Amino acid sequence: KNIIIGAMTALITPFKNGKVDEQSYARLIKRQIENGIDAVVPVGTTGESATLTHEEHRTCIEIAVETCKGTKVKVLAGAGSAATHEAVGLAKFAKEHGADGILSVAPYYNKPTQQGLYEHYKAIAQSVDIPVLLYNVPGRTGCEISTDTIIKLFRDCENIYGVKEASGNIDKCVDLLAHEPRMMLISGEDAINYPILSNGGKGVISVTSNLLPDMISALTHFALDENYKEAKKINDELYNINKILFCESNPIPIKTAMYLAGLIESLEFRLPLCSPSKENFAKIEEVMKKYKIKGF
Amino acid sequence: KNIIIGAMTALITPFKNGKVDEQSYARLIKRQIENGIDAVVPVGTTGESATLTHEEHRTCIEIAVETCKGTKVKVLAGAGSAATHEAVGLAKFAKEHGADGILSVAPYYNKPTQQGLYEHYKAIAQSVDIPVLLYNVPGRTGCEISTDTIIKLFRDCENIYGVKEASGNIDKCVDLLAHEPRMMLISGEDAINYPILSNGGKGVISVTSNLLPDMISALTHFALDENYKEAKKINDELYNINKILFCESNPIPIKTAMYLAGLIESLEFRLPLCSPSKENFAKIEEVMKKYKIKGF
Ligand SMILES: N[C@@H](CCCC[NH3+])C(=O)O
Ligand SMILES: N[C@@H](CCCC[NH3+])C(=O)O
Ligand SMILES: [Mg+2]
Ligand SMILES: [Mg+2]
Ligand SMILES: [Mg+2]
Ligand SMILES: [Mg+2]
């Protein structure tokens, strides 16, 4: 299978005056490129995918593709939806506009059965000829892609090559790679990046890397080389920031940190997302002082 | 406050050859009207709101309004979204096209904070002058509107008059009406319709009423008239069907039952929803046999 692995970033989507700041978006990519990141994910959960229009979603994918041309960095485009017809539409757009692959979150809100999840992802995978990474995040979607369904999809669909797990379930990570060691398990939870990688996971799709791309990149590449002492030391050092970046729903803390670091101009979200509490704003600022944040 | 209460049905959306069957939709609503229902909810969770287009969503609202015109039966239009700007757009459409009020599910997938939920619903409520019913279903959305937030919205926003609770939490139902007895608590879980009504809830938004509108409307009306003995009797009798209609994610079992009863032409879902397993198909059919199903 064709694959997209390594250190990857779930890009925030900056706003200015309520619209996507397209110049800031491109500048934030490139900063990721220049700090060792292997792939970028435009318009995932961290990118406020649910509140962008379909037009804005597509614009962000195009900016990511244009910014990564001439580099090794790959574009793994967010293309998920609760509706299969909408997910297929985004998948085809990403393919026709030069993305290297797609990420596709399990349908949220409507809680499809495992049979429905299989048919959902089969239709997505059959619609394009680029790699497809599944994405399981039950705390957000209200459903789980079972290990059996993930493995069936990997084995049955040529371009489905693995899963991004955000489920706090290392047992399932063992289950997945013990029964199907050819898949690419990707960590979707920064605090446990190292345990997932050390069980044979092959990359991360990170929130923390928005702020600390060099540290997440080094952690991942140490682990892929089986330099587990060095990978664990970075994972341990990052624990405090990894947890404070979820003191409120992601991406509220990460955008707060990017603003405090002067990496975005305004602390702007699209409703129903909004600024953190005053107390949490101060907690994020405090934890940040313990880390070296690269500029532009 | 202007209110919409009583026995209400979360209408299924029948499909024919992948498109909304608009004549079937009107026929099913007339059947609800002839069996005592007080209001209908077009395009809620049970109506596959997540996979309809915005244009099909609007068409179903218009059919409900037209079919109910000249009856006493109100239309409480589904108008929720994870994106506040989309929810405001649906609310304004429902107002402009003659709906009596709107239902608005808590934003799913992006997990807004309580402050965000407050600002989301404030924006919706300020955009129209018709009643607004909140809707809490954390197993689907991944978030919970707290009792404090619900009560604040009820008190601060003239249009917001209550909440549809689908949370399996009778403690919260007591909390709500003990601290704010003026709100309209609406049951969103059929199996516990009577316990919610007997604590002072003032209506139901039912799945089961798609199949048995006469039984759900009688249950509600007994309870509102303080005949708890007869209300509980129907609630008890309905437990088996109320539970089997959730053996797979709603609306998979209810559409299966409507098809088995000859009330819709074809067992058609929009992906990622799909037919139940053969075992669950047979179990739904078996449970239905103990109930008398009204025809057209
Ligand atoms: N609010 C809709 C539309 C998002 C479209 C852009 N990804 C949803 O969550 O599916
Ligand atoms: N699939 C999108 C669009 C649905 C529009 C009609 N309710 C969502 O879940 O928000
Ligand atoms: Mg290229
Ligand atoms: Mg996605
Ligand atoms: Mg009546
Ligand atoms: Mg709704």
Side-chain angles (χ1 to χ4, degrees), chain A residues 1-15 17-29 31-110 112-274 276-277 279-288 290-296, chain B residues 1-29 31-71 73-296:
Chain A
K1 298 178 182 262
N2 304 56
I3 69 180
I4 300 175
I5 60 167
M8 319 182 242
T9 297
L11 303 164
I12 58 151
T13 303
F15 297 120
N17 300 323
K19 303 174 212 163
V20 175
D21 185 339
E22 302 184 16
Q23 294 65 39
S24 175
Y25 202 58
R27 188 180 195 196
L28 286 166
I29 321 168
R31 181 176 170 270
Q32 294 294 310
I33 293 167
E34 286 166 15
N35 277 286
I37 289 295
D38 297 297
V40 296
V41 179
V43 198
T45 321
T46 307
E48 288 171 85
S49 66
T51 68
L52 296 190
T53 64
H54 271 291
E55 192 183 308
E56 286 167 327
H57 191 146
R58 283 163 176 74
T59 292
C60 287
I61 289 175
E62 294 182 291
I63 295 173
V65 170
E66 187 64 24
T67 305
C68 290
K69 287 186 182 173
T71 77
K72 211 182 151 196
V73 185
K74 289 180 173 176
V75 174
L76 182 70
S81 176
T84 308
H85 70 85
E86 282 178 77
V88 167
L90 281 157
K92 295 184 78 158
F93 178 93
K95 155 72 189 188
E96 296 172 2
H97 288 260
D100 296 285
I102 54 164
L103 181 73
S104 195
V105 72
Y108 40 85
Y109 185 54
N110 55 12
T113 66
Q114 296 304 300
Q115 178 65 37
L117 285 170
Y118 181 90
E119 296 185 31
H120 176 78
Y121 280 123
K122 181 153 149 294
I124 291 159
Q126 288 181 347
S127 81
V128 296
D129 68 351
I130 54 175
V132 173
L133 195 74
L134 314 176
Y135 173 20
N136 187 56
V137 55
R140 293 308 190 84
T141 67
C143 80
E144 178 96 345
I145 323 168
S146 73
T147 291
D148 284 336
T149 300
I150 294 161
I151 288 177
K152 283 186 175 176
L153 284 166
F154 174 86
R155 293 179 180 165
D156 293 356
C157 301
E158 180 187 341
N159 43 343
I160 292 175
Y161 74 100
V163 56
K164 170 186 175 198
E165 275 296 337
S167 54
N169 190 348
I170 201 69
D171 181 291
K172 184 187 191 185
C173 291
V174 170
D175 190 12
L176 283 165
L177 289 189
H179 292 97
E180 186 41 272
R182 300 170 292 165
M183 79 168 73
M184 299 303 135
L185 171 62
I186 304 297
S187 170
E189 286 176 325
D190 276 297
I192 66 173
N193 280 339
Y194 167 74
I196 284 170
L197 292 167
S198 73
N199 191 234
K202 291 300 178 199
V204 311
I205 291 167
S206 172
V207 170
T208 300
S209 68
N210 282 279
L211 186 67
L212 307 169
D214 55 325
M215 301 184 70
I216 292 291
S217 165
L219 186 170
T220 304
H221 292 304
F222 275 131
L224 288 174
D225 278 349
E226 299 184 275
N227 292 320
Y228 286 156
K229 170 209 235 305
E230 295 95 333
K232 171 179 152 60
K233 177 188 172 102
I234 299 177
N235 199 73
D236 288 345
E237 191 195 359
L238 288 176
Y239 187 88
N240 285 346
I241 184 88
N242 286 338
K243 304 297 303 187
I244 207 69
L245 288 177
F246 293 81
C247 66
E248 303 192 9
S249 297
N250 175 62
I252 291 171
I254 187 51
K255 274 184 134 180
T256 299
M258 298 293 277
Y259 167 79
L260 283 161
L263 297 172
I264 61 181
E265 183 184 330
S266 161
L267 187 49
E268 265 188 68
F269 305 86
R270 200 163 276 178
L271 279 176
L273 296 192
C274 65
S277 72
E279 171 159 311
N280 280 335
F281 186 97
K283 286 182 181 188
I284 294 165
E285 185 172 33
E286 261 323 281
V287 173
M288 289 173 67
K290 310 306 301 264
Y291 301 87
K292 304 240 192 283
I293 300 163
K294 302 248 169 160
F296 290 110
Chain B
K1 294 179 177 268
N2 299 305
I3 71 183
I4 301 181
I5 59 161
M8 318 185 236
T9 295
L11 303 162
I12 58 157
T13 304
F15 297 119
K16 175 187 248 254
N17 305 134
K19 295 143 141 212
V20 176
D21 185 336
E22 297 184 28
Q23 312 74 40
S24 184
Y25 200 62
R27 199 183 188 199
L28 295 166
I29 291 166
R31 181 177 170 269
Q32 295 296 307
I33 293 167
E34 293 192 88
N35 278 286
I37 287 290
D38 298 312
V40 298
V41 180
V43 197
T45 323
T46 309
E48 292 172 83
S49 61
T51 65
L52 300 190
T53 68
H54 267 290
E55 172 165 319
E56 298 168 316
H57 190 148
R58 287 162 168 75
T59 291
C60 290
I61 293 176
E62 297 177 312
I63 295 174
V65 176
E66 182 54 50
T67 305
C68 286
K69 193 174 132 182
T71 70
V73 178
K74 301 182 183 178
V75 176
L76 181 75
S81 180
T84 307
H85 67 86
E86 285 177 78
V88 168
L90 279 162
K92 299 200 329 196
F93 178 96
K95 161 63 190 196
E96 289 176 6
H97 290 72
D100 297 279
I102 60 159
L103 182 75
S104 196
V105 69
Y108 39 90
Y109 185 57
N110 51 10
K111 198 161 189 222
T113 63
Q114 296 305 303
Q115 178 71 35
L117 289 165
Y118 182 85
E119 299 183 28
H120 172 80
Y121 281 122
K122 190 164 152 180
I124 290 152
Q126 291 177 342
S127 77
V128 301
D129 60 3
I130 54 174
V132 173
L133 194 75
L134 310 180
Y135 173 19
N136 188 58
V137 54
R140 287 179 178 276
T141 66
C143 76
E144 166 98 357
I145 324 167
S146 73
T147 293
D148 280 337
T149 299
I150 292 160
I151 290 173
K152 275 179 160 175
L153 286 164
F154 177 88
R155 287 180 186 165
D156 293 357
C157 299
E158 193 180 337
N159 278 343
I160 297 178
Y161 75 96
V163 56
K164 176 190 173 192
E165 274 293 341
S167 54
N169 191 347
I170 205 69
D171 182 293
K172 186 182 184 197
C173 291
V174 177
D175 194 11
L176 281 159
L177 295 185
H179 292 99
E180 185 41 85
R182 300 168 298 177
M183 76 167 75
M184 302 303 135
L185 168 66
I186 305 301
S187 167
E189 278 172 331
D190 273 301
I192 65 165
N193 282 340
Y194 165 73
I196 287 174
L197 292 166
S198 74
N199 191 236
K202 291 298 169 184
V204 310
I205 287 166
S206 166
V207 176
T208 299
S209 65
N210 280 277
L211 185 70
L212 308 166
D214 54 319
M215 301 188 73
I216 290 287
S217 68
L219 192 166
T220 305
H221 294 144
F222 278 126
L224 290 174
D225 289 330
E226 299 184 45
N227 196 325
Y228 287 172
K229 182 194 182 264
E230 293 306 313
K232 163 178 163 63
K233 178 177 168 298
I234 299 176
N235 201 74
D236 288 348
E237 183 184 358
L238 286 173
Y239 187 85
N240 284 340
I241 183 87
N242 285 342
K243 294 307 287 186
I244 208 64
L245 288 173
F246 291 80
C247 66
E248 307 195 3
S249 300
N250 173 60
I252 292 171
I254 184 60
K255 266 184 155 182
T256 298
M258 298 293 284
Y259 167 79
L260 282 164
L263 295 170
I264 54 173
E265 181 166 350
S266 57
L267 191 40
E268 267 189 61
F269 302 92
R270 199 162 277 182
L271 278 176
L273 298 191
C274 63
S275 286
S277 71
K278 314 262 202 133
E279 181 176 311
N280 281 332
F281 189 97
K283 282 187 322 144
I284 294 151
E285 185 173 33
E286 172 180 43
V287 171
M288 283 166 75
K289 304 313 199 144
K290 311 302 202 133
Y291 301 89
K292 293 214 211 43
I293 299 162
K294 298 272 188 169
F296 290 110

